[PDB]
Amino acid sequence: SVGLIWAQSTSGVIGRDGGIPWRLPEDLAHFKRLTMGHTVVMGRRTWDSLPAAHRPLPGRRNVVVTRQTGLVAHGAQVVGSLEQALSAETWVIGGAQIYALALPLANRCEVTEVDVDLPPEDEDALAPVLDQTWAGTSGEWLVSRSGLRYRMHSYRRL
Residues of the shown chain interacting with ligand NAP in the complex, contacts defined by CB under 6 A: 6-7, 14-15, 18-20, 42-46, 49, 65-68, 80-81, 93-98, 101, 125
Tell me if 102 contacts ligand WPD by CB under 6 A: no
Q: How far is the CB of 80 from Br ion (least distance, A)?
A: 27
39 touches ligand WPD (CB under 6 A)? no
Q: Which of 2/125 has CB closer to ligand NAP? A: 125
Which one among 2, 3, 5, 44 touches ligand WPD, defined by CB under 6 A? 5
- CA distance to 4, 16, 23, 64, 126, per residue, from 120 (Å): 21, 9, 18, 26, 8
Question: Does 45 carry a binding-site annotation?
Answer: yes
Q: Which whole-number Å values give the CA distances from 33 to 50, 81, 132, in the listed order?
A: 17, 26, 27
**DSSP-H helix ranges across 1-158:** 25-35, 44-49, 82-86, 96-102
CA 72/CA 78 separation, integer angstroms: 8
Closest CA to 91 of 131, 145, 151, 32: 32
How many residues bind Br ion (CB under 5 A)? The answer is: 3
Residue 18 sits in the site that holds Br ion (CB under 5 A): no
Of residues 84 through 113, those in contact with Br ion by CB under 5 A are none
